[PDB]
Amino acid sequence: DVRVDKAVNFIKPEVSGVAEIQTVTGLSPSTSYLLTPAFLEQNFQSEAGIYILSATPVEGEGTISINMDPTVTTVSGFIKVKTDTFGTFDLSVVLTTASKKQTTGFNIIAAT
Amino acid sequence: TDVRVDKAVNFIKPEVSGVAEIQTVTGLSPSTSYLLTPAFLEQNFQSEAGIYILSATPVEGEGTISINMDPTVTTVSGFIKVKTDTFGTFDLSVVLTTASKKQTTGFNIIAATS
């Protein structure tokens, strides 16, 4: 089968254009996961500016892009990452404008 | 043990507002379960008035994909679990609230692999 093992929100980095590390824990050791973006009922115009998030694995493939530009809107990409022996993996997450404090996230999918 | 995107598929563009149509997805492995997740790339949902709102549900399966581009309440969420028939197909029910929103959205078909 394929299932969503965990649904997590993206972090909200403090400084525009400066990525921060997001660590996901508690997963199965040395296991391949696929991450896909998702978000629910968000107001991306609740304050000035454009919500633009990029996420990449420190060790893996792919990029998630969430760009809510009203002219050119993208919610796409997927990440392949394998946990270490502890059941953890790290992403690098950046917001182009850090005052966009909407909540977005991803699904963590495994075959089991 | 591993997982991959088997294929990326665009959602249909229903012709009539509010009237669900079937989208038949083909070419997969017989009698096999997949997960579907939403995605879209570089769309201008404001090329004309009105809101792009799509909902998709398998005819036989679990979950609903929702893509609601309302600027006050924007959703790109849900995931569908669906099993193919013995010929490698499955059907979705897809409904667009305003059919004149001809933007392109879609889903990833996620599969187990080695």
Numbering used by the authors:
A (entry chain A): 7 to 118
B (entry chain B): 6 to 119
Sentences from the paper on this structure:
A major factor that limits the expansion of shrimp cultures is, however, infectious diseases from viruses, such as P. vannamei nodavirus (PvNV) and M. rosenbergii nodavirus (MrNV), which have inflicted heavy economic losses. The Nodaviridae genome comprises two single-stranded positive-sense RNA that encode the capsid protein for viral capsid assembly, the RNA polymerase for RNA replication, and the B2 protein for host RNA interference suppressor. While the shell domains (S-domains) of PvNV and MrNV contain conserved sequences of 62% identity, the protrusion domains (P-domains) and N-arms show low sequence identities of only 17% and 43%, respectively. In this work, we have determined the cryo-EM structures of T = 3 and T = 1 PvNV-LPs at atomic resolution, the crystal structures of the P-domains of PvNV and MrNV (PvNVPd and MrNVPd), and the crystal structure of the S-domain of PvNV (ΔN-ARM-PvNVSd) in the T = 1 subviral particle (SVP).
The PvNVPd forms dimers in two crystal forms with the asymmetric unit containing one dimer (space group P21) and two dimers (P212121). The PvNVPd structure (P21) were first determined using Se-Met-derivatized crystals with single-wavelength anomalous diffraction (SAD). All structures of the PvNVPd were refined to resolutions 1.17–1.22 Å. The structures of PvNVPd from two crystal forms are similar with a root mean square deviation (RMSD) < 0.3 Å; and residues 250–368 were resolved in both structures. The structural fold of the PvNVPd consists of eight β-strands, differing from that of any other known viral capsid protein. The P-domain monomer folds into the core jelly-roll topology, forming a β-sandwich face-to-face with two pairs of antiparallel β-sheet. Four highly exposed turn insertions β1/β2, β3/β4, β5/β6, and β7/β8 appear on the top regions of the PvNVPd and might play an important role in the determination of the antigenicity. The semi-flexible N-terminal linker (residues 250–255) located beneath the P-domain must be disordered as there is absence of electron density. In the dimeric structures of PvNVPd and MrNVPd, the domain–domain contacts at the interface are 2-fold symmetrically formed with a hydrogen-bond network between the main chains of the antiparallel β-strands, β3 and β6. Notably, the sequence of the interaction region (Gln273–Asp278) of MrNVPd is distinct from that of PvNVPd, and two types (P21 and P212121) of PVNVPd structures do not exhibit the X-shaped conformation.
